[PDB]
Design a protein that fits this description.
The structure is a homodimer.
Chain A: H1 4-14, H2 18-30, H3 35-42, E1 48-50, H4 64-73, E2 82-88, E3 91-94, H5 103-111, E4 115-118, H6 126-139, E5 143-150, E6 165-173, E7 175-180, E8 207-211, E9 216-219, E10 224-228, E11 235-242, H7 248-266, H8 292-307, H9 314-328, H10 336-340, E12 350-351, E13 354-355, E14 365-368, E15 374-379, E16 382-387, E17 402-404, H11 410-418, E18 424-425, H12 434-446, E19 450-452
Antiparallel strand pairs in A: 1-9, 2-3, 2-4, 4-5, 5-11, 6-9, 6-11, 7-8, 7-10, 12-13, 14-18, 14-19, 15-16, 16-17
Helix pairs in contact in A: 1-2, 2-6
The structure holds pyridine-2,4-dicarboxylic acid (2 copies) and nickel (II) ion (2 copies).
Amino acid sequence: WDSPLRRVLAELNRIPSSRRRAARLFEWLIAPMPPDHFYRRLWEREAVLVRRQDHTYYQGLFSTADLDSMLRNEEVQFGQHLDAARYINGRRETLNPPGRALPAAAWSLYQAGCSLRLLCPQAFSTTVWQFLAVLQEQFGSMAGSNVYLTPPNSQGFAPHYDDIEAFVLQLEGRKLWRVYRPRAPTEELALTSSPNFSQDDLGEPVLQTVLEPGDLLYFPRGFIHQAECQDGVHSLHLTLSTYQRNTWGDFLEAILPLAVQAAMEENVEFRRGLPRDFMDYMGAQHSDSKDPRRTAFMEKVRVLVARLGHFAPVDAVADQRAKDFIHDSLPPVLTDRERALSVYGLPIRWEAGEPVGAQLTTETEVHMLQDGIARLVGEGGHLFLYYTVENSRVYHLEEPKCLEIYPQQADAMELLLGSYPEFVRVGDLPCDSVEDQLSLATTLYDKGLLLTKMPLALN
Amino acid sequence: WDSPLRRVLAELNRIPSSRRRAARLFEWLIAPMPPDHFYRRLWEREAVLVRRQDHTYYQGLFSTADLDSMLRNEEVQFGQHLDAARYINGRRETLNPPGRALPAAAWSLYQAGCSLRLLCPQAFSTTVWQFLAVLQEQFGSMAGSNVYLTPPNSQGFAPHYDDIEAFVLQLEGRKLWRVYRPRAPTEELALTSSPNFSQDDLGEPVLQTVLEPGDLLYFPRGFIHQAECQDGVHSLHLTLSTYQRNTWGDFLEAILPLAVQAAMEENVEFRRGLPRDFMDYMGAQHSDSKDPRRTAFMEKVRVLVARLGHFAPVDAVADQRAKDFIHDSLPPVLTDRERALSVYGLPIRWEAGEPVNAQLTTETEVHMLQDGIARLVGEGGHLFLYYTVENSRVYHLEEPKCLEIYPQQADAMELLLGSYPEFVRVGDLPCDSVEDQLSLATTLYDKGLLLTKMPLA
Ligand SMILES: O=C(O)c1ccnc(C(=O)O)c1
Ligand SMILES: O=C(O)c1ccnc(C(=O)O)c1
Ligand code: NI
Ligand code: NI
């Protein structure tokens, strides 16, 4: 009933700013490790174990009972949602029968030594949803999760490394973990998940420990890990994942094709003809040419690549990544106050089976419903506000969702995005006319994107 | 019978090297302008007029009589091969009926004021083919052509600029041309053809002249041009086109995705995470941010972009472009000596209705059939020799054609490509066995890619 997790969620309900709620929840997650230290020295660099000394820390997030219930009450499929795996005599086996994962089947596999992995707990647990939806706001990147249930004296998976930053939350029982430094330069901060390794591919762990409930274990993409239950106790953990494909290189991948295009359009030097005869000295068949033009060609290509930096539309790409992040995000979890001050909590009056709202005025005080639900993006000379409030808890079930923002409302919209959580009077919005102030505010409110200082209707 | 064009083609037939032939033909094309001056100062920079003072200069390349004949004897289609166009009352009209362009239809369109434009004369004229096949070898880029026949007192086309470098060869009659400097910075060396312009979009011509037969007019992509026949005389010209999408930027377009990919794979700095909160200070809503992290973000982008050069597979991209060029190329036109010394000129012996006859030997002296017909390209794990000798005179009618070169033949193949036109003994080829020397030479010969010093039969 009353755990540190339930206490901190009650606290978050009272923090008016979504930004401040995200920072606090992250702070709680790694408490008493300071986030400042964590992000400066440890993140993307070191494996980290937080010994919590509190078995109740995470209670309410997820339990085996929740798993059983979801298998029974929801349409959980093998493969798509749940895997059954064993690592036995040095080999990973997958024992997923096809179709629905009923309790009977899942618990038999478990008694046969199979670990069970739930791929999308947030689609089924509202507590995991809330937890992820808040944390994503301070990562700037989708926050996903997997739940792992491993029976006693067993190992579910071959050693591997992931392509995401991982925070292992130990929920029930105990598990012996071994985590390894990237084995080689190319596996440091790996771009994609590893193959299954054998114990012969591995050195000595940088960290080897038995996790107990309440503990946390963080480690970067590229760090090989494996885990096993010792005698008697089963293991249940939740792994929070973020930062899949969120590298400088991913940023450059979107920028360069646009940069080249802009250069070629804006600067005639990029549009000049290649030499007529460069094929006599460039290409595989000429890799040992002594021709001094070869060196001049190589050097010109290098210098032109570097000059491309000037034409890189860094801002438009930050925005595209912002739009993708909106699209990937979980829908928000509203505080009581947010619900009550928005379209979501607007009560309807009923008289003899029929309904009987109240319009916004220039005196209505407003601000964005939350700080991480919307993004203004220029595309093709139009302006669009993309938002998360209609996203599903299933990853990319819904297509990207936006509304057009007209040029005469652009400054008002920017003010609203930039001034959260401060209230602004609709009559103060810097639009051309009074009708524009009202129309913009009403559009945003009716769509679930704005709250008012006092509700617009009452019981 | 005997024009400067026929004389120069006869001369080319005696120049053993295809490279030299190409340079000599280009020299002839702009004579007496030196190519060295042309390529250093004029190319891609200036409109240029060569007043030849010789009406016969181009005789034999193409004529109205050739057009008539090709309409009658070949399957020339409207749209695909020939357009009938008029510029009248300030508008471009296309009067192309669908289907085949018979003489009757084309000459009626002509008499109603239509210019006739032949999109692919080299598909039908063996002299235009030869001319283009030789010149492409000194451009490093497909050489195309169009033929324009414009009736008297008429204009076929709206003013426009092209996306290729143009050399207008005046073949018959006279035409008043007006050429314009790029109107604006973005139209200098333009990347794609212009819309149809009106006379109101245009300034004063940088060059305005009446071309006569023999004359040449060159002008770069981006230069607006138009032309018209005055009283009495019709006009026939051939425009030679090259250098479509052959820019540094096109080269960089193909290199950047590979460069990023190699950098992210080979160097951990490209694999580090972006900041969690960069969206608070980057993006269009933040172009005026005071935030000093915006400045540090920009600097890191610049430093990472500058380092990308080290991971660019410049040779691999040169090769891809070389393969596209092989694919785009016209098939070669062999000299007499080339034909006779290759598989093409090998006679078959017939006895009582059956064929009867040499193998190459380690003593046979060889070199590539021509210098511009083949290219070694590394792709995936493998090595392939792409070649032009099976290309059609129609652009991309044939898909790209290659044969695999096994790793232990690579050096020999390179020596052959790099040492043309010097004869090498098959026994001198730097392979690892005698059998490899022979197999590589035989494969190349049988494919039409090699000639021998003496015929084999
Ligand atoms: O519990 C495991 O066996 C296991 C294996 C691989 N990965 C994870 C994880 O949380 O990443 C857990
Ligand atoms: O002769 C013409 O009207 C004309 C128009 C556009 N282009 C060309 C050409 O030779 O490019 C010629
Ligand atoms: Ni893992
Ligand atoms: Ni033109």
